[PDB]
Amino acid sequence: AWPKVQPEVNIGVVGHVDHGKTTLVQAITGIWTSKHSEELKRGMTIKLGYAETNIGVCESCKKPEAYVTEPSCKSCGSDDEPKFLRRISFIDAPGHEVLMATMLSGAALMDGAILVVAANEPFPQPQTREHFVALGIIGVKNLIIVQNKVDVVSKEEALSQYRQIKQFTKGTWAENVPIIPVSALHKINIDSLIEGIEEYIKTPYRDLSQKPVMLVIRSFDVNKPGTQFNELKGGVIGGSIIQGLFKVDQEIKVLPGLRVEKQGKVSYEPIFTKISSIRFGDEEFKEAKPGGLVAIGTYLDPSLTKADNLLGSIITLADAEVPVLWNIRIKYNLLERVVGAKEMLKVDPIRAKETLMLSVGSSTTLGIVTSVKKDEIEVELRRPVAVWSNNIRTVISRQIAGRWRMIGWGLVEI
Amino acid sequence: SEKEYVEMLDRLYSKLPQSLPNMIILNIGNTTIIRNFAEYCDRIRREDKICMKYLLKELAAPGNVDDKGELVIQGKFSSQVINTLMERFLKAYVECSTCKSLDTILKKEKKSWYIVCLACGAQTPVKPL
RNA sequence: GCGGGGUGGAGCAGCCUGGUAGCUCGUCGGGCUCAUAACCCGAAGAUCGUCGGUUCAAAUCCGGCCCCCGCUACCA
Numbered sequence: 001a002w003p004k005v006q007p008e009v010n011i012g013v014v015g016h017v018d019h020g021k022t023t024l025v026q027a028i029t030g031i032w033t034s035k036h037s038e039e040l041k042r043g044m045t046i047k048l049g050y051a052e053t054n055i056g057v058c059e060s061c062k063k064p065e066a067y068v069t070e071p072s073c074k075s076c077g078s079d080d081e082p083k084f085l086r087r088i089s090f091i092d093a094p095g096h097e098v099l100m101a102t103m104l105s106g107a108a109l110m111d112g113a114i115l116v117v118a119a120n121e122p123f124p125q126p127q128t129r130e131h132f133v134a135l136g137i138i139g140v141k142n143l144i145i146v147q148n149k150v151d152v153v154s155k156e157e158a159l160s161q162y163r164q165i166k167q168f169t170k171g172t173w174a175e176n177v178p179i180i181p182v183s184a185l186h187k188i189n190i191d192s193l194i195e196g197i198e199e200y201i202k203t204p205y206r207d208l209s210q211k212p213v214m215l216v217i218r219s220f221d222v223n224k225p226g227t228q229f230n231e232l233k234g235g236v237i238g239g240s241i242i243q244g245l246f247k248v249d250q251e252i253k254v255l256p257g258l259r260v261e262k263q264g265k266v267s268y269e270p271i272f273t274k275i276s277s278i279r280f281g282d283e284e285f286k287e288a289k290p291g292g293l294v295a296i297g298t299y300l301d302p303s304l305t306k307a308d309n310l311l312g313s314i315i316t317l318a319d320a321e322v323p324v325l326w327n328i329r330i331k332y333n334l335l336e337r338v339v340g341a342k343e344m345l346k347v348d349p350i351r352a353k354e355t356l357m358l359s360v361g362s363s364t365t366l367g368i369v370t371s372v373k374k375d376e377i378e379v380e381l382r383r384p385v386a387v388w389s390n391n392i393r394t395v396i397s398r399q400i401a402g403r404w405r406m407i408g409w410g411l412v413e414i
Numbered sequence: 415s416e417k418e419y420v421e422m423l424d425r426l427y428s429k430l431p432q433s434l435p436n437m438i439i440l441n442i443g444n445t446t447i448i449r450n451f452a453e454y455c456d457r458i459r460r461e462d463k464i465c466m467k468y469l470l471k472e473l474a475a476p477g478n479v480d481d482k483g484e485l486v487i488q489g490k491f492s493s494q495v496i497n498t499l500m501e502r503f504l505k506a507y508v509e510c511s512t513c514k515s516l517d518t519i520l521k522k523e524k525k526s527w528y529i530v531c532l533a534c535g536a537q538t539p540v541k542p543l
Numbered sequence: 544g545c546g547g548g549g550u551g552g553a554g555c556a557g558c559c560u561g562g563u564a565g566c567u568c569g570u571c572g573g574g575c576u577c578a579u580a581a582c583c584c585g586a587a588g589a590u591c592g593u594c595g596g597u598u599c600a601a602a603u604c605c606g607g608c609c610c611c612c613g614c615u616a617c618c619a
């Protein structure tokens with residue numbers, strides 16, 4: 001029987017509306033990423049979800065149907081137990097435009113990407129540009145392109161869109177991102193899809209040397225309605241680890257965490273605690289290694305953490321130090337066109353006192369600029385962001401008709 | 415690398431839209447004969463070392479598996495009583511918690527024996543016996 | 544936690560303290576006025592969500608159930 005190994009790789013599942021995204025993660029895992037009632041009741045992706053699975057290959061059978069993700073080989077007709085490789089998970093993003101910023105969080109976490117295109121929508125849909133440039137600003141050039149729902153669209157139209165998207169590949173960072181045809185519901189060609197994730201998207205070389213940082217994405221009060229005071233568990237903060245690792249009873253701080261009132265003005269309080277639990281899905285590990293969202297509950301009160309309060313915050317070692325600056329400088333190079341836009345106008349350069357949106361790792365902010373230079377800016381924020389490295393990948397947007405569409409790429413010089 | 419779409423489509427165009435064996439327990443002399451034990455527990459990946467682990471204690475009678483896979487029991491018993499007895503294996507280790515698919519297997523470990531389900535993968539706290 | 548609303552074209556009364564299904568805007572008819580609005584009078588309209596128990600006897604005491612629901616959230 002098959003070992004119990006935490007995921008060592010994340011993959012971004014991004015794409016536009018109705019493309020077959022959540023159904024793709026169902027095709028790979030067997031489970032969906034709609035977890036808040038509104039997500040089902042509206043039938044569209046609003047927030048980022050989670051899903052997990054393994055990978056085993058039958059050394060005897062041919063490719064690729066034997067590439068099944070359970071301790072079995074029966075789909076290729078073999079009796080042998082396949083060779084295990086890993087446990088693989090994903091970041092299921094939205095397609096909507098008022099909801100784009102969210103997936104940007106996940107863009108800083110994924111170690112891969114499977115990007116979908118609609119055979120059954122007019123191509124290129126506007127927001128597809130915004131996903132592609134999201135991957136390009138964050139810089140995960142490792143991409144597997146797929147055309148979806150092929151059961152209603154004929155094989156010639158599939159070929160025409162395949163030529164369109166083979167073209168979409170050439171001329172950019174993605175000259176050789178491949179196209180492997182699958183359908184997310186009927187479980188077709190998903191074996192070749194797993195083979196594609198494997199071959200073309202390998203987990204990076206890990207750096208277990210830098211200060212272990214945990215990038216918050218979600219959090220919950222697991223204390224159920226009716227929880228009496230005897231069995232009170234701490235509030236879980238879930239994310240993914242990128243550099244370092246976490247252990248049982250590690251002394252940490254949540255940064256920034258809470259707001260408190262300080263010195264006649266506003267400020268934040270660094271949230272100190274001891275690590276009490278670290279979960280990967282439905283398996284209990286005592287250590288957390290990089291690759292895949294890692295949920296850590298601690299000795300913190302879940303009132304501070306329930307309902308995605310701290311969204312995107314960072315957490316580091318309680319003997320660490322990170323620059324927390326209320327007003328941050330940015331080297332920003334502006335996009336050449338507005339990518340998710342139905343009609344791509346020009347970029348109107350950013351003038352003083354304007355309002356702009358930032359996503360730093362997973363944390364988000366609104367800000368107004370105070371000193372406008374051509375490439376360098378110093379922007380005053382409504383909350384200081386935690387900049388754990390030099391020139392971190394922030395993603396920046398200006399508001400268009402009520403939809404904050406991106407305007408450039410920025411670097412915080414600390 | 416233009417062939418990286420053609421054949422994959424050609425075999426994309428070819429995927430478009432187990433039960434309990436009727437165990438017949440017979441008796442001759444003072445033994446128990448069955449028909450399809452090579453494909454009764456081997457339908458659910460159940461070893462011959464592990465399927466005769468709790469049954470030896472629940473019947474208190476010696477016995478072993480054959481080369482074909484059949485299971486011989488020393489004693490006189492009816493047909494529908496072996497299942498009512500071995501319920502503590504048919505429900506305690508080879509079932510699930512939220513699927514009820516019967517397509518499950520057991521694990522062998524150094525601290526407990528888990529229930530790997532090929533429908534969900536739901537386990538329970540139990541100690542092998 | 545499981546419980547409530549079950550009733551004229553409607554809006555809700557109306558229980559425990561059992562024998563008029565109760566008052567109001569509405570509906571058609573008649574009065575008053577030179578004529579219209581307001582004001583006075585008369586009839587028509589659910590017959591209580593439904594089986595069942597209590598009960599001489601029930602919206603009125605309640606249960607079984609059919610409908611509408613209703614205070615409520617991913618539980619690493």
Ligand SMILES: Nc1nc2c(ncn2[C@@H]2O[C@H](COP(=O)(O)OP(=O)(O)NP(=O)(O)O)[C@@H](O)[C@H]2O)c(=O)[nH]1
Pocket residue numbers: 015016017018019020021022023024043044045046093094095096148149151183184185186
């Ligand atoms: N036939 C078929 N239907 C599919 C497939 N994928 C999804 N669907 C169904 O088609 C509808 C729209 O697809 P959807 O699952 O929303 O894809 P999505 O890209 O995740 N949409 P969003 O991210 O906005 O929530 C839904 O009813 C869904 O069940 C597919 O591959 N084939």
Ligand SMILES: [Mg+2]
Pocket residue numbers: 021022044045093094095
């Ligand atoms: Mg979706």
Ligand SMILES: [Mg+2]
Pocket residue numbers: 579
């Ligand atoms: Mg009048």
